[PDB]
Amino acid sequence: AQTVPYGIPLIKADKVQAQGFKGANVKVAVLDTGIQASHPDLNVVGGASFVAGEAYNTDGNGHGTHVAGTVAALDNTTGVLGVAPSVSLYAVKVLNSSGSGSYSGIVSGIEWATTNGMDVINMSLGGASGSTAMKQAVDNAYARGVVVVAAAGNSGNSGSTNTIGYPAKYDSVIAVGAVDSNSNRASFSSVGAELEVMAPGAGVYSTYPTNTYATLNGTSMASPHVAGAAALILSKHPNLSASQVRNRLSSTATYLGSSFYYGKGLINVEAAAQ
Numbered sequence: 001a002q003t004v005p006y007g008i009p010l011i012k013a014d015k016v017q018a019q020g021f022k023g024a025n026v027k028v029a030v031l032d033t034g035i036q037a038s039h040p041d042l043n044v045v046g047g048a049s050f051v052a053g054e055a056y057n058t059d060g061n062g063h064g065t066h067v068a069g070t071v072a073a074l075d076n077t078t079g080v081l082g083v084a085p086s087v088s089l090y091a092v093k094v095l096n097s098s099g100s101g102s103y104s105g106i107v108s109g110i111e112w113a114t115t116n117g118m119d120v121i122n123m124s125l126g127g128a129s130g131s132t133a134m135k136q137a138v139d140n141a142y143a144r145g146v147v148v149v150a151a152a153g154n155s156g157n158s159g160s161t162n163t164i165g166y167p168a169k170y171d172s173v174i175a176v177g178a179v180d181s182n183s184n185r186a187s188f189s190s191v192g193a194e195l196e197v198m199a200p201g202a203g204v205y206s207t208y209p210t211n212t213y214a215t216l217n218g219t220s221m222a223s224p225h226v227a228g229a230a231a232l233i234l235s236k237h238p239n240l241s242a243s244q245v246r247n248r249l250s251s252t253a254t255y256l257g258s259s260f261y262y263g264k265g266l267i268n269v270e271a272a273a274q
């Protein structure tokens, strides 16, 4: 009755869960389209909304619920299972129904998250340009000790061109690319010098608005696997600082090829949480 997405076992979050670390007491903010708070396979603890006319606990798109599900779908006897099922999950709505947002909305969600003591911030969104405010916001958060993860882009590769977007491209943020069930790079995955790590993003099944489950493709599906891995590491080593968790993700990743296409490689959380 409970499904275990191929993604969980691939990054070895399952081996870590078995030792008893599931992310309990770790606070994760999901900056997205909101989350369908009423889904039986999710436990949303609070949040804020920076989008006019929509509250933070509804998702009229589905993208946000899906991401939330990869980080934390409940460990129970139904639906799916998240990377860090026991985390404290906040939904910060920065994107609208159609899936897009304004830089000031985003900057507001990023600062909300710093002021409210989030340990991990997930951003499965990106644009061609950043801003000085966006840059300030991510530098300070990370300087204040939060772990910031973003999706690199579903821009693919084209020549020697860098197709990573903002805020992934900022060096205070972990840019995440996507792989398939065979650990092969998905065709859509952005490339460039700022690519840091790879995670599952092709054919990812997760929670979906109106109490169901669905399969989606993207770096948006990949990023959450890393936010969640960050949270596992912290439930195991509370003592760690942000750049210590980060450096653990990249140092112990599985080598898959050139860094321009794969960063340091596929994440392995068992190795990282050593």
Ligand SMILES: [Ca+2]
Residues within 6 Å of the ligand: 002, 041, 073, 074, 075, 076, 077, 078, 079, 080, 081
């Ligand atoms: Ca479940």
Ligand SMILES: [Ca+2]
Residues within 6 Å of the ligand: 168, 169, 170, 171, 172, 173, 174, 175, 194
């Ligand atoms: Ca970066």
